Chain A
Amino acid sequence: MDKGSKVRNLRKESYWFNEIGTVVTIDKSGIKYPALVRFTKVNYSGTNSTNFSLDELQEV
């Protein structure tokens, strides 16, 4: 929704499913997955951020 806002993940395949992550950047220039989110826990690959579509995030 906005920079720095916490969002609950809804991507079923995501390692951070049902977890809270902070939005880093949002691309207003179209794009299918514009909302970059960062989570505290690192996934199995060691990364802690991913791009999601606004439909795949619960706002708060």
Chain B
Amino acid sequence: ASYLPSILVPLVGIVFPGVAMALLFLYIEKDDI
């Protein structure tokens, strides 16, 4: 409480989208299954 936003907003707006886009990029052009 009053500490969580600092921890989470960077994760939700940078780390989460970064990893999500990395995995989606891997899967879109996987070329198998």
Please say whether the chains A and B touch (CB closer than 8 A). Answer: no
Residues of B at the A interface (CB closer than 8 Å) are none
